[PDB]
Scaffold this active site. Structure first.
Site, PDB file in Angstrom:
ATOM      1  N   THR A  60      -5.665   7.107   7.573  1.00  0.00           N
ATOM      2  CA  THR A  60      -6.286   7.622   6.251  1.00  0.00           C
ATOM      3  C   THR A  60      -6.302   6.212   5.311  1.00  0.00           C
ATOM      4  O   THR A  60      -6.607   6.328   4.166  1.00  0.00           O
ATOM      5  CB  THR A  60      -5.418   8.280   5.490  1.00  0.00           C
ATOM      6  OG1 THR A  60      -4.144   7.916   5.435  1.00  0.00           O
ATOM      7  CG2 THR A  60      -5.086  10.130   6.126  1.00  0.00           C
TER       8      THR A  60
ATOM      9  N   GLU B 262      -2.117  13.887   0.602  1.00  0.00           N
ATOM     10  CA  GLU B 262      -3.571  13.622   1.339  1.00  0.00           C
ATOM     11  C   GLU B 262      -4.244  14.771   1.946  1.00  0.00           C
ATOM     12  O   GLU B 262      -5.100  15.121   1.239  1.00  0.00           O
ATOM     13  CB  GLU B 262      -3.312  12.343   2.446  1.00  0.00           C
ATOM     14  CG  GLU B 262      -2.496  11.200   2.132  1.00  0.00           C
ATOM     15  CD  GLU B 262      -3.083   9.835   2.552  1.00  0.00           C
ATOM     16  OE1 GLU B 262      -2.821   9.825   3.855  1.00  0.00           O
ATOM     17  OE2 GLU B 262      -4.017   9.212   1.979  1.00  0.00           O
TER      18      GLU B 262
ATOM     19  N   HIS C  83       4.448  10.855   6.239  1.00  0.00           N
ATOM     20  CA  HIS C  83       3.789  10.599   7.463  1.00  0.00           C
ATOM     21  C   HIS C  83       4.757   9.914   8.394  1.00  0.00           C
ATOM     22  O   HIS C  83       5.327   8.884   8.049  1.00  0.00           O
ATOM     23  CB  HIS C  83       2.497   9.764   7.544  1.00  0.00           C
ATOM     24  CG  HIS C  83       1.488  10.475   6.732  1.00  0.00           C
ATOM     25  ND1 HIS C  83       0.060   9.762   6.120  1.00  0.00           N
ATOM     26  CD2 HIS C  83       1.032  11.607   6.672  1.00  0.00           C
ATOM     27  CE1 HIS C  83      -0.487  10.635   5.751  1.00  0.00           C
ATOM     28  NE2 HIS C  83       0.069  11.745   6.041  1.00  0.00           N
TER      29      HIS C  83
ATOM     30  N   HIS D 240       0.800  -1.137  -0.118  1.00  0.00           N
ATOM     31  CA  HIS D 240      -0.009  -0.061  -0.047  1.00  0.00           C
ATOM     32  C   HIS D 240       0.926   1.360   0.010  1.00  0.00           C
ATOM     33  O   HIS D 240       0.402   2.353  -0.280  1.00  0.00           O
ATOM     34  CB  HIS D 240      -1.063   0.015   1.186  1.00  0.00           C
ATOM     35  CG  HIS D 240      -1.831  -1.057   1.297  1.00  0.00           C
ATOM     36  ND1 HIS D 240      -2.890  -1.463   0.264  1.00  0.00           N
ATOM     37  CD2 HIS D 240      -1.857  -2.253   2.146  1.00  0.00           C
ATOM     38  CE1 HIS D 240      -3.413  -2.734   0.786  1.00  0.00           C
ATOM     39  NE2 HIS D 240      -2.756  -3.243   1.919  1.00  0.00           N
TER      40      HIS D 240
HETATM   41  N1  LIG Z   1      -1.830   6.991   6.339  1.00  0.00           N
HETATM   42  S1  LIG Z   1      -1.743   6.854   8.052  1.00  0.00           S
HETATM   43  O1  LIG Z   1      -0.485   7.468   8.690  1.00  0.00           O
HETATM   44  O2  LIG Z   1      -3.028   7.257   8.861  1.00  0.00           O
HETATM   45  C1  LIG Z   1      -1.761   5.066   8.542  1.00  0.00           C
HETATM   46  C2  LIG Z   1      -2.689   4.198   8.253  1.00  0.00           C
HETATM   47  C3  LIG Z   1      -2.583   3.020   8.672  1.00  0.00           C
HETATM   48  C4  LIG Z   1      -1.545   2.439   9.350  1.00  0.00           C
HETATM   49  C5  LIG Z   1      -0.521   3.247   9.829  1.00  0.00           C
HETATM   50  C6  LIG Z   1       0.333   3.091  10.820  1.00  0.00           C
HETATM   51  O3  LIG Z   1       1.502   3.588  11.215  1.00  0.00           O
HETATM   52  C7  LIG Z   1       0.226   1.593  11.678  1.00  0.00           C
HETATM   53  S2  LIG Z   1      -1.009   1.821  12.770  1.00  0.00           S
HETATM   54  C8  LIG Z   1      -1.895   0.387  12.120  1.00  0.00           C
HETATM   55  N2  LIG Z   1      -1.516  -0.455  11.255  1.00  0.00           N
HETATM   56  C9  LIG Z   1      -2.420  -1.673  10.511  1.00  0.00           C
HETATM   57  C10 LIG Z   1      -3.516  -1.782  11.385  1.00  0.00           C
HETATM   58  C11 LIG Z   1      -3.954  -1.001  12.161  1.00  0.00           C
HETATM   59  N3  LIG Z   1      -3.251   0.309  12.745  1.00  0.00           N
HETATM   60  C12 LIG Z   1      -0.608   4.587   9.538  1.00  0.00           C
HETATM   61 ZN   LIG Z   2      -0.078   7.798   5.769  1.00  0.00          ZN
END
Ligand SMILES: NS(=O)(=O)c1cccc(C(=O)CSc2ncccn2)c1
Ligand SMILES: [Zn+2]
Ligand SMILES: NS(=O)(=O)c1cccc(C(=O)CSc2ncccn2)c1
Ligand SMILES: [Zn+2]
Lengths: 259, 261
Positions: free
Chosen positions: A195, A101, A114, A63
């Site tokens: 996000t 974003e 991020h 991703h």
């Molecule tokens: N683009 S983001 O920073 O909001 C984003 C999206 C998904 C995961 C993360 C993480 O740093 C890991 S926290 C997580 N990962 C997988 C499932 C649940 N939480 C950051």
């Molecule tokens: Zn992110």
């Protein structure tokens, strides 16, 4: 889940109910929803200068491309201490290189970094923190085309070893603070979400006001290096436009540290 | 049911209306990277738009917008088939953030947006059978901005305080619908997309006029504050505000323009 086609973002809510719930990010940062808060203090970045004798795992998770970061990296200036877990990027595509974003007054930037942290005073690790009150704090840096950036090249030069989902490479320690812009003291702050799925409404967002610059060639490299699929997938898909559309943001406010 | 806010808002439309998660979705942001001039794009001709002042037309709060029914003798000519009018309606924001157009231009949201909805009447019986069929629909979009009072829009807006709740109707004498169109209607954006409301059918040929029209601060406020999504009896009213869809991804596609830049 993906960013294109039938399992794209308008379908995320089917398997991940929070993607159609409260506090969603990203948003458009515009005057009607901004309010200066004179109490917001500048962040302090501790332990960001990673030892060159240590190394750090770079992963294509299907991703984005992530770097793992050590829990000894911390930010000060929020109510609880938050320790680092990973950093990653979002971007667009070569025909439309406008894939940040967050937007500012409706304008996309080329890309967005991020730096993800979890509440280490409350929680043992990021996984546990991710779906709990106060669990996460993300720093966001907006990226535009400009001069070549030696510090972002510390990530980008390894990209050809993580082309397919699941692949990994190590990156020697470098100073993470060099990825941050000018005058970090000026920022937007608001309560929001991840996000991507699962879109947990558990994130405290700090988006810095000032963008950094990477060259055209660095941006094109990032846009063309990676694939979302595993090396034996019979239907390969390029890793492009890996950003969410901005969300409705209503009867709520974003606070600024600059008036 | 569906709304623009809460558990039933736009991120969850796909659950009950599967085309909302599918291809060709509207609205979009109209910006240079995805625009190309097409010199073959000719002026539309607007026929029967000068509605009989001796006839009345039904205006309706349908719980999602305020809609004016239009007659089948009104039509657009200039596309492969004739398209006949079916209704017009609007989309707006709210008084604290008065930026509720659907389409945006270089990331700019306008105050509001008018849609004049037509169906392909050469190929199909009526709008509801044209709706989920290929090249079934064509929609004209007018971008609205806050400024000068607009007498022609007020032909609709002066009824708003008499259709405040879902299901209510008023009668509007005919007037010239061409007077809701902006200057230089020969200049427009053109693309293939969808209805911006559930069931989100990917069946719309879009024409978005280049130039906005203006309405007054007072008219825009009346539009944003007069109306409710709920019935008159409802112990818990919901205001009809922010009834526009976020812009959609638009990747490896092109919007064609009839003006050059
Ligand atoms: N683009 S983001 O920073 O909001 C984003 C999206 C998904 C995961 C993360 C993480 O740093 C890991 S926290 C997580 N990962 C997988 C499932 C649940 N939480 C950051
Ligand atoms: Zn992110
Ligand atoms: N905002 S829109 O112009 O794309 C639009 C939205 C909703 C309905 C309509 C129509 O009346 C098309 S006919 C129809 N109406 C509802 C459901 C299916 N078809 C147009
Ligand atoms: Zn509409």
């Amino acid at each position: 889940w993906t960013y294109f086609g039938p399992d794209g973002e308008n379908s995320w809510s089917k398997k991940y109910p929070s993607c159609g719930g409260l506090l969603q990010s990203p948003i458009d940062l515009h005057s009607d929803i901004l309010q200066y808060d004179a109490s917001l203090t500048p962040l302090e970045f501790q332990g960001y200068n990673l030892s060159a004798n240590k190394q750090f795992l770079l992963t294509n998770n299907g991703h984005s491309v992530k770097l793992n970061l050590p829990s000894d990296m911390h930010i000060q200036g929020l109510q609880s201490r938050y320790s680092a877990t990973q950093l990653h990027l979002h971007w667009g595509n070569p025909n439309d290189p406008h894939g940040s974003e967050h937007t500012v007054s409706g304008q996309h930037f080329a890309a967005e970094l991020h730096i993800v942290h979890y509440n280490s005073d409350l929680y043992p690790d990021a996984s546990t923190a991710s779906n709990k009150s106060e669990g996460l704090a993300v720093l966001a840096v907006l990226i535009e085309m400009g001069s070549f950036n030696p510090s972002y090249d510390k990530i980008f030069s390894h990209l050809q070893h993580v082309k397919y989902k699941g692949q990994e490479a190590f990156v020697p320690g470098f100073n993470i603070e060099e990825l941050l812009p000018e005058r970090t003291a000026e920022y937007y702050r608001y309560r929001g979400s991840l996000t991507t799925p699962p879109c947990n409404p558990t994130v405290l967002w700090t988006v810095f006001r000032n963008p950094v610059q990477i060259s055209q060639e660095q941006l094109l490299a990032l846009e063309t290096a990676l694939y979302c699929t595993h090396m034996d997938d019979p239907s390969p898909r390029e890793m492009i436009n890996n950003f969410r559309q901005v969300q409705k943001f209503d009867e709520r406010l974003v606070y600024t540290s600059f008036s």
